[PDB]
Design a protein around this ligand. Structure first.
Ligand code: WAH
Ligand code: WAH
Lengths: 237, 300
């Protein structure tokens, strides 16, 4: 059934699984028209499909042309997500196909189940975890590839950089979710933490800075402070 | 007007005949039911006084044979049987009528209720859902499971209702996933009406047969089937106008006949609220919506 704090280590076992987050698929700016009405303008989006054990990220870029002439876009976006995830699964060799797909929002369950009828043995699961994957577009290299896209495109990344050489998947996921939670709660501050220091480069082939083990401890502490702080500035505590 | 003669009534029992019912005391001189209208299927059903568990009964059509009830003390139930000797049977019956040992099917002349509940129900079609090929009548009880229930255990004792499953390859054309799930017209009109059922008379008949088994026996799988068949029509944007008009009449008489005190268990809140207020056909069931709103506004 649902994925929560109790069965949390299941994410790091040897059964292939993917999280799917659809938050950033349909993105708009809201603006005034010449007549003083309100209209939306779509901007490019992305499906965030992540293997939490290996860090492999399948970033399917959703170009605004997919919305042209379509109605009820927020509903369509869920079905388009499910269509693209199904197409990704079919494209993978059998031994790489997931045994479970965990959707971050329960409204993805029926669209994905329907698109995966041909795969009765792949479990489609919700989660009670409040995961911060919406903040993926605060990672500069991911935002850049999405905004520059002129056509539908899939781009592959490892969201853990080389961290798995030194830490376990559990610890790598914990770091990722801490970074993304910080970026979601106060993007400007989080990005200042990550990059204020101009002596730590981000490698061309990486997403995050090249911190030593000790520097990661300081970084992680600084992100925890930020999250608690903002939780202060928010609730006045 | 036909008759169903009883050898006797050895155990106290409430006997239903269609929408009517009456109590018979242990060893009371009861010898059956006369004046049964020809032209419709009928159901004769039983609930024992000592064990209200297991309502059970028999669907039959007197045009197909001479049928009588005799209690079996070994299996502990009232059994329907066919007598093949037409003359012995006419004789036992005329005798019981002369002794006035029978209840009369108590139909009011103005009243079309049973016709309206059984318009597309016939004995031959009933046997395609409930199987015992050696008898012309069909036994149903409260506990019998449906073929679909058995997929999610005795096959011979099952109601073969056509499996309806909205998240199934049968319901969903490859490449039309969103379209077919949000608008079930292709599943309704092509798969079910043109392919399996063959016409709306057959679809309406299974829908009606499902309701009556739910109402008379508390058969849970039949209730599921009735609601699934309603939901499949209501969730289709393209339905022939005559089917919508007939469905409104069918459901109206079903809601009208339902015991007020069984609405809680026999009516699915989600399906009815979806069908009456959210579906493509939210505005096409005027008679059903009016009776539901005036009789069961709590559910909604
Ligand atoms: C008891 C056996 N009799 S019988 O064989 O003539 C069939 C029959 C039985 C009971 C009836 F009320 C009517 C017909
Ligand atoms: C595919 C099976 N169709 S059917 O025509 O037997 C449905 C039906 C069943 C029972 C009835 F009393 C009337 C109709």
């Amino acid at each position: 059934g649902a994925m929560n704090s109790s069965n949390y280590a299941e994410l790091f076992n040897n059964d292939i699984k993917l999280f799917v987050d659809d938050t950033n698929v349909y993105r708009v700016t809201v603006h005034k028209t010449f007549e003083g009405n309100v209209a939306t303008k779509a901007i490019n989006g992305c499906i965030f499909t992540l293997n939490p054990k290996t860090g492999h990220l399948f970033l399917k870029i959703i170009h605004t042309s997919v919305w042209a002439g379509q109605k009820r876009l927020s509903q369509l976006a869920k079905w388009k997500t499910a269509e693209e995830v199904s197409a990704l699964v079919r494209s993978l060799p059998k031994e790489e196909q997931p045994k479970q797909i965990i959707v971050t929002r329960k409204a993805m369950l029926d669209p994905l189940e329907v698109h995966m009828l041909d795969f009765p043995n792949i479990a489609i699961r919700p989660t009670e975890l409040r995961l911060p994957f919406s903040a993926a577009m605060s990672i500069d290299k991911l935002s850049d590839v999405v905004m520059k896209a002129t056509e539908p495109q899939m781009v592959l990344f490892n969201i853990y950089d080389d961290w798995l050489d030194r830490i376990s998947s559990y610890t790598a996921f914990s770091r990722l979710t801490l970074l993304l939670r910080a970026l979601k709660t106060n993007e400007e501050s989080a990005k200042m933490i990550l990059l204020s220091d101009p002596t730590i480069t981000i490698k061309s082939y990486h997403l995050w800075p090249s911190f030593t083990d000790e520097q990661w401890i300081t970084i992680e502490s600084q992100m925890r402070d930020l999250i608690l702080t903002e939780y202060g500035r928010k609730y006045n505590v | 007007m036909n008759t169903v003669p009883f050898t006797s009534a050895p155990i106290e029992v409430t006997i239903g005949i269609d929408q009517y019912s009456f109590n018979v005391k242990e060893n009371q001189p009861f010898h059956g039911i006369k004046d049964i209208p020809i032209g419709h299927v009928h159901v004769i059903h039983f609930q024992h006084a000592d064990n209200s568990s297991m309502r059970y009964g028999y669907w039959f059509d007197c045009r197909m044979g001479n049928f009588y009830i005799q209690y079996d003390p070994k299996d502990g139930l009232y059994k329907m049987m066919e007598e093949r000797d037409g003359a012995k049977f006419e004789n036992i019956v005329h005798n019981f009528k002369e002794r006035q040992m029978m209840v009369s099917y108590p139909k009011i002349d103005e009243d079309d209720t049973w016709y309206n509940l059984t318009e597309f129900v016939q004995m031959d079609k009933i046997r395609k859902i409930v199987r015992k090929d050696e008898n012309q009548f069909s036994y149903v009880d409260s506990s019998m499971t449906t073929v679909q229930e058995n997929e999610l255990s005795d096959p011979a004792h099952s109601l073969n209702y056509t499996v309806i499953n909205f998240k199934s390859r049968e319901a969903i054309r490859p490449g039309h996933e969103m379209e077919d799930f949000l608008d079930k017209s292709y599943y309704l009109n092509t798969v079910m009406l043109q392919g399996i059922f063959k016409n709306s008379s057959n679809y309406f008949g299974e829908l009606q047969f499902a309701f009556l088994n739910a109402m008379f026996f508390g058969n849970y799988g039949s209730s599921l089937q009735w609601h699934a068949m309603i939901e499949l029509i209501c969730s289709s944007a393209t339905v022939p106008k005559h089917m919508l008009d007939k469905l409104d009449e069918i459901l109206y008489y079903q809601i009208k006949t339902l015991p007020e005190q069984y609405s809680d268990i026999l009516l699915n809140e989600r399906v009815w609220n979806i069908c009456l207020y959210s579906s493509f056909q939210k505005n096409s069931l005027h008679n059903t919506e009016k009776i539901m709103e005036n009789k069961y506004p709590e559910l909604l």
